[PDB]
């Protein structure tokens, strides 16, 4: 399954992400991919050799824009760093 | 004469910046310091 925050467990390694068809070219024998800080970033599908990405499914703070309650009980929320289709 | 000197001096600044980059060490140092702080913070996650 792709494009959903899933809790994957590929053959050895686990973790939660959003598997997406990538364009990275592993070497024939490599399995993982890592980031500059040693975090999993690409996994080779051990059944069909298509290299998928791993995007940690969106999190982020929630702020509450508000005029003072001395003005009105109305607010507006701000979700930080989301494509605004995941709310 | 003052006009010519001022224009030529601006030009020399342009060149000095365009050729060597170790003049901007001050900003780059801040950016690198924060990048390394974050990288140490993250790499602490892989310790027992």
């Amino acid at each position: 399954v792709k494009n959903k925050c899933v809790n994957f467990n590929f053959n050895g390694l686990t973790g939660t992400g959003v598997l997406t068809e990538s364009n990275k070219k592993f070497l024939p024998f490599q399995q993982f991919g890592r980031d500059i800080a040693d975090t999993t970033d690409a996994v080779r599908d051990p059944q069909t050799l298509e290299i998928l990405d791993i995007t940690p499914c969106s999190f982020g703070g929630v702020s509450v824009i508000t005029p003072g309650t001395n003005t009105s009980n109305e607010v507006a929320v701000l979700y930080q760093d989301v494509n605004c289709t995941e709310v | 004469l003052i006009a010519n000197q001022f224009n030529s001096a601006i030009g020399k600044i342009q060149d000095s910046l365009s050729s060597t980059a170790s003049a901007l060490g001050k900003l780059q140092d801040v950016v690198n310091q924060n990048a390394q702080a974050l990288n140490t913070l993250v790499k602490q996650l892989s310790s027992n």
Binding site: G61, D81 | L17, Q28, V42
Partner: peptide, 22 residues
């Protein structure tokens, strides 16, 4: 000349570079 998984959010600066330039 001048050149993510664990809550490390990087907020954006309130004044964007165009407004600084202005």
């Amino acid at each position: 000349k001048v050149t993510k998984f664990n809550g490390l959010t990087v907020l954006p600066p309130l004044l964007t570079d165009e407004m600084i330039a202005q």
